[PDB]
Ligand SMILES: *[C@@H]1O[C@H](CO)[C@@H](O[C@@H]2O[C@H](CO)[C@@H](O[C@@H]3O[C@H](CO)[C@@H](O)[C@H](O)[C@@H]3O)[C@H](O)[C@H]2NC(C)=O)[C@H](O)[C@H]1NC(C)=O
Ligand SMILES: *[C@@H]1O[C@H](CO)[C@@H](O[C@@H]2O[C@H](CO)[C@@H](O[C@@H]3O[C@H](CO)[C@@H](O)[C@H](O)[C@@H]3O)[C@H](O)[C@H]2NC(C)=O)[C@H](O)[C@H]1NC(C)=O
Ligand SMILES: *[C@@H]1O[C@H](CO)[C@@H](O[C@@H]2O[C@H](CO)[C@@H](O)[C@H](O)[C@H]2NC(C)=O)[C@H](O)[C@H]1NC(C)=O
Ligand SMILES: *[C@@H]1O[C@H](CO)[C@@H](O[C@@H]2O[C@H](CO)[C@@H](O)[C@H](O)[C@H]2NC(C)=O)[C@H](O)[C@H]1NC(C)=O
Ligand SMILES: *[C@@H]1O[C@H](CO)[C@@H](O[C@@H]2O[C@H](CO)[C@@H](O)[C@H](O)[C@H]2NC(C)=O)[C@H](O)[C@H]1NC(C)=O
Ligand SMILES: *[C@@H]1O[C@H](CO)[C@@H](O[C@@H]2O[C@H](CO)[C@@H](O)[C@H](O)[C@H]2NC(C)=O)[C@H](O)[C@H]1NC(C)=O
Ligand SMILES: *[C@@H]1O[C@H](CO)[C@@H](O[C@@H]2O[C@H](CO)[C@@H](O)[C@H](O)[C@H]2NC(C)=O)[C@H](O)[C@H]1NC(C)=O
Ligand SMILES: *[C@@H]1O[C@H](CO)[C@@H](O[C@@H]2O[C@H](CO)[C@@H](O)[C@H](O)[C@H]2NC(C)=O)[C@H](O)[C@H]1NC(C)=O
Ligand SMILES: *[C@@H]1O[C@H](CO)[C@@H](O[C@@H]2O[C@H](CO)[C@@H](O)[C@H](O)[C@H]2NC(C)=O)[C@H](O)[C@H]1NC(C)=O
Ligand SMILES: *[C@@H]1O[C@H](CO)[C@@H](O[C@@H]2O[C@H](CO)[C@@H](O)[C@H](O)[C@H]2NC(C)=O)[C@H](O)[C@H]1NC(C)=O
Ligand SMILES: *[C@@H]1O[C@H](CO)[C@@H](O[C@@H]2O[C@H](CO)[C@@H](O)[C@H](O)[C@H]2NC(C)=O)[C@H](O)[C@H]1NC(C)=O
Ligand SMILES: *[C@@H]1O[C@H](CO)[C@@H](O[C@@H]2O[C@H](CO)[C@@H](O)[C@H](O)[C@H]2NC(C)=O)[C@H](O)[C@H]1NC(C)=O
Ligand SMILES: *[C@@H]1O[C@H](CO)[C@@H](O[C@@H]2O[C@H](CO)[C@@H](O)[C@H](O)[C@H]2NC(C)=O)[C@H](O)[C@H]1NC(C)=O
Ligand SMILES: *[C@@H]1O[C@H](CO)[C@@H](O[C@@H]2O[C@H](CO)[C@@H](O)[C@H](O)[C@H]2NC(C)=O)[C@H](O)[C@H]1NC(C)=O
Ligand SMILES: *[C@@H]1O[C@H](CO)[C@@H](O)[C@H](O)[C@H]1NC(C)=O
Ligand SMILES: *[C@@H]1O[C@H](CO)[C@@H](O)[C@H](O)[C@H]1NC(C)=O
């Protein structure tokens with residue numbers, strides 16, 4: 001909420017929505033090069 | 042014939058037409074007309090479309106390092122962006138205590154920064170109310186009542202039609218009706234149900250009471266420029282001393298104005314009741330204090346010396362009301378929409394007519410020898426119901442059948 | 451879970467799963483499907499060659 | 501219709517922060533004072549404070565300085581935080597509603613079921629049995645132990661019971 | 666600022682009961698609580714009644730005292746009653762609380778038993794009026810037994826009862 005602070009959070013994403021970019025591995029959301037998603041209420 | 046659009050509204054005729062309908066008695070009801078419910082929607086619609094080209098103050102929800110009448114003003118320093126997206130600046134401002142909340146000392150944020158980002162009011166559009174006339178479409182009519190003893194409900198025998206209504210100023214206020222129409226003969230008490238104590242009471246005066254204000258702080262406004270073409274008008278240093286805002290009501294008029302109010306209130310509650318007044322019992326700041334807009338700044342005045350009297354049935358002193366100033370304004374009680382008011386340079390003075398009250402009775406007994414009346418407010422539909430009380434919209438049904446001793450060949 | 455991504459904006463994320471993780475499946479009855487496919491293939495043989 | 505539901509921990513250590521959360525279901529968060537109350541067995545019913553949707557709060561002067569109430573209109577939720585709780589701050593905590601307007605004749609509506617908390621110094625101790633005829637348990641923590649008179653909460657925070665035959 | 670109520674009111678079934686408050690300057694509203702149940706209003710002004718509340722409850726205010734009368738008390742509404750008055754500084758002021766109980770079974774005398782140890786213990790049992798006082802410390806709130814009676818215990822004796830005293 002305050003734009004000078006950050007938070008480290010975690011979530012559980014499905015495999016079909018997550019693509020690599022290359023202990024753990026770096027990934028990204030699938031539409032990070034096409035558009036931006038609108039979350040349904 | 043500003044935030045109140047005079048462009049969209051068509052020009053009216055220079056002279057109106059008013060036909061006096063003789064032998065006509067029509068039943069009115071001020072509490073269930075659909076001319077105030079459309080008006081409230083139009084006030085909201087023409088309010089929130091003038092804040093559409095204005096700047097959105099979303100980069101300003103930051104951590105504010107804040108230091109110190111007394112304790113009202115806080116000196117807050119904070120980071121801020123620049124027109125160039127690579128650089129940053131460190132700025133300061135003077136905020137109020139009613140606008141900031143502690144993060145958990147010397148650690149503050151704005152009060153709205155969990156709910157929404159406020160939209161700063163544009164510094165060129167004005168907040169002055171202008172008269173707007175509500176004209177009827179084709180095939181319809183507006184029937185003004187012209188009785189001088191009308192109490193809102195019931196039959197009016199002096200019905201006259203009109204082209205358009207008179208000039209109704211959208212003045213928003215609480216506990217007092219500033220800049221309104223005056224009664225002609227006597228002080229009028231209007232309520233939906235007198236016996237029920239859950240109904241607000243509208244008191245209309247026949248003479249006005251003048252109120253004058255000061256904001257004695259010589260404020261300086263500086264433009265902290267956020268990005269490309271976007272600015273944030275903060276509060277700079279205050280030149281001279283710092284004194285609280287106040288505004289005054291003359292004692293010799295408010296006394297015997299309350300006398301006329303008590304004399305007209307004893308006609309519904311009995312000839313021997315002791316009429317009392319108390320200051321407030323609300324919980325919100327907009328309900329407890331007399332909230333209005335003087336000169337561009339939103340004042341919340343503590344009207345406790347006005348409503349402090351008892352009345353039992355048998356020359357230059359003034360009452361000073363201290364007021365508080367707030368900048369983050371949630372006006373129409375919509376969840377998630379605020380507005381930041383920029384500061385105004387110099388000294389701001391009211392001059393206004395108190396033309397009514399919104400009272401509320403405390404019940405308790407079926408046979409009471411005393412009555413307590415406290416100021417109300419809250420909903421803004423009772424502000425414009427004191428002006429659209431004589432009007433009524435009707436449709437014309439011009440098709441009739443009648444018996445006559447004649448037949449078609 | 452709710453993650454505040456700004457003023458009044460929340461992102462609803464999937465948290466922990468209570469219990470075991472199993473596949474989501476789609477049951478379709480077998481005899482009813484065989485009868486319905488028979489009703490389909492009768493009129494398909496009518497329209498396409500007997 | 502609007503229903504209110506409390507949620508929070510049941511055991512809070514002394515000199516800590518007690519956090520509760522009331523979630524509403526149905527209705528809207530506007531035009532309502534959301535209030536917090538508690539029902540202590542020693543001092544009766546009490547009022548802690550309310551909060552409006554804008555952010556304006558109102559706390560009780562007895563609990564002023566160590567209380568904080570906040571809202572969340574995006575999730576239809578509000579929460580209470582009490583600081584530096586002692587052993588006398590145990591009660592049943594309710595969340596309620598008040599209509600916006602004059603509070604001279606206003607009464608609390610939309611009560612919750614009540615969440616019971618207890619502030620004790622949790623020193624876990626085994627029971628000590630003394631014969632008397634009957635038996636006595638001197639000090640133990642926590643409730644319960646089977647053996648039947650009910651337990652006694654002492655001033656040191658340890659329970660005690662007795663049995664006769 | 667204090668609001669004073671009687672600590673207990675005990676009546677027979679079929680008999681009316683009265684609860685008085687004092688020190689009230691504005692309108693008083695009455696709440697009824699139950700053990701393990703949420704509070705509810707029964708008289709939300711000096712005389713008014715909300716929907717769903719039966720007509721056995723009636724209140725009236727005279728001067729600074731507001732009274733609540735229950736007409737024909739039953740085995741139901743054996744409960745604690747509080748009052749509420751709005752005030753300027755503290756927004757809501759509550760009363761001390763009045764316990765209304767009914768006598769659906771006749772009075773029985775308690776049985777005390779003392780045990781030498783250094784802990785001295787007195788056990789009290791089998792008494793229907795639960796208001797008992799112990800003199801010689803920690804004492805219990807008298808809870809209900811399985812046979813619809815009350816028991817209590819003391820730790821470290823004489824006990825005082827309604828018209829009686831037993832010293833051991
Ligand atoms: C309506 O008027 C009444 C008085 O006619 C106002 O009540 C007064 O409120 C002030 C501040 O809120 C109280 O002062 C405080 O009192 C105690 C003294 O023990 C102390 O905690 C503080 O130092 C402070 O001085 C004052 O006692 C109280 N007066 C009474 C008789 O209760 C009331 O605020 C007004 N209501 C409004 C403007 O809505
Ligand atoms: C009730 O009506 C009166 C009279 O119209 C209002 O007072 C007026 O307030 C406006 C606020 O914008 C003043 O305009 C400003 O005044 C000075 C001098 O020109 C300057 O700062 C600006 O250029 C601007 O014109 C106006 O002068 C003032 N009228 C008088 C006679 O002093 C009053 O505000 C109304 N009350 C409410 C609650 O709306
Ligand atoms: C956005 O990025 C995705 C992920 O890399 C691209 O999808 C792949 O595109 C390549 C192009 O050579 C294909 O070979 C793959 O089959 C695609 N899918 C996957 C799952 O790797 C996508 O084309 C990109 N979109 C753009 C550049 O517009
Ligand atoms: C508010 O605080 C700022 C600092 O954040 C004050 O500005 C300083 O004022 C002193 C005294 O006049 C000057 O010597 C400094 O040069 C100022 N610093 C900057 C960065 O401008 C400011 O005066 C305070 N305002 C008050 C107390 O009204
Ligand atoms: C404006 O930004 C500056 C630059 O980051 C802040 O100064 C630093 O603040 C951090 C906060 O964690 C301190 O640890 C540093 O010691 C500060 N100085 C430097 C040189 O890095 C400054 O606090 C910001 N102003 C605010 C928040 O009012
Ligand atoms: C406050 O009330 C006074 C008294 O009614 C108003 O002064 C009158 O204004 C009208 C405007 O049409 C004139 O026709 C009258 O001659 C005025 N009367 C007097 C005695 O001066 C005054 O305009 C009101 N002020 C506001 C801001 O509405
Ligand atoms: C407004 O005035 C009318 C007309 O006097 C009142 O209407 C009367 O209401 C009473 C209510 O019991 C009826 O019995 C009468 O028949 C009505 N008519 C007349 C001609 O008396 C109305 O109550 C008034 N409203 C107020 C004072 O709020
Ligand atoms: C105006 O309010 C009074 C007071 O509440 C109403 O009179 C009550 O009416 C109800 C039924 O609606 C009766 O049960 C009460 O006994 C009445 N109380 C009294 C003191 O007479 C009255 O009905 C309201 N007026 C209208 C037109 O609805
Ligand atoms: C409201 O009235 C008060 C007095 O009741 C006015 O305060 C006086 O203002 C003058 C002019 O600056 C000073 O010389 C006096 O010393 C002040 N009196 C006191 C007791 O402080 C005030 O200006 C009035 N406000 C208005 C007219 O807006
Ligand atoms: C508020 O402060 C400003 C700045 O000091 C004042 O503006 C001065 O006004 C005088 C008198 O008209 C002029 O001679 C000066 O040139 C102005 N500027 C400066 C920099 O001194 C302004 O008058 C003050 N406001 C009030 C109401 O006194
Ligand atoms: C509000 O302000 C007006 C002026 O704006 C005051 O009217 C002045 O009153 C004094 C004292 O009677 C007269 O000498 C002036 O001639 C009046 N001026 C004007 C322009 O009429 C009025 O008294 C103030 N009202 C208050 C303080 O209640
Ligand atoms: C509104 O004004 C009244 C009186 O004008 C204030 O009441 C005074 O409050 C102060 C606060 O320190 C007390 O010391 C006084 O004893 C009170 N006066 C009386 C006559 O009771 C009232 O607090 C103001 N309301 C606010 C600030 O919300
Ligand atoms: C996803 O990974 C996170 C860490 O990135 C896991 O969170 C940790 O879970 C362990 C379980 O033993 C806890 O001990 C840690 O305290 C947790 N850390 C944090 C920061 O919360 C999380 O459980 C994983 N989710 C799964 C496996 O569903
Ligand atoms: C899909 O689910 C429904 C509801 O659970 C199943 O319907 C039940 O069928 C059994 C026999 O297989 C009956 O005894 C139950 O009474 C039915 N339930 C109800 C609520 O009517 C249905 O069989 C399932 N479909 C499948 C497995 O293909
Ligand atoms: C400084 O600011 C604090 C903020 O809590 C305030 O209480 C105090 O009155 C101010 N002044 C002094 C001299 O400490
Ligand atoms: C509101 O902001 C405060 C101050 O930073 C913060 O403690 C609180 O958690 C916020 N509320 C929500 C619901 O995020």
Ligand SMILES: *[C@@H]1O[C@H](CO)[C@@H](O)[C@H](O)[C@H]1NC(C)=O
Nearest residue numbers: 304307308309311312313354
């Ligand atoms: C109340 O007093 C006025 C005073 O003029 C009088 O006209 C009226 O008749 C009185 N009403 C009653 C019911 O006595």
Ligand SMILES: *[C@@H]1O[C@H](CO)[C@@H](O)[C@H](O)[C@H]1NC(C)=O
Nearest residue numbers: 318319345346348349350351
């Ligand atoms: C009315 O005002 C006076 C003077 O401001 C004050 O002393 C008095 O207490 C007030 N009356 C009441 C009933 O509070």
Ligand SMILES: *[C@@H]1O[C@H](CO)[C@@H](O)[C@H](O)[C@H]1NC(C)=O
Nearest residue numbers: 465466467468469470471472
């Ligand atoms: C997870 O695994 C353990 C060990 O297999 C099992 O006993 C336990 O029940 C599982 N947890 C849940 C929540 O099902």
Ligand SMILES: *[C@@H]1O[C@H](CO)[C@@H](O)[C@H](O)[C@H]1NC(C)=O
Nearest residue numbers: 492494495496497498499500
């Ligand atoms: C298709 O074959 C079936 C075999 O039973 C026969 O009854 C039917 O007449 C045939 N239809 C045509 C159009 O030849």
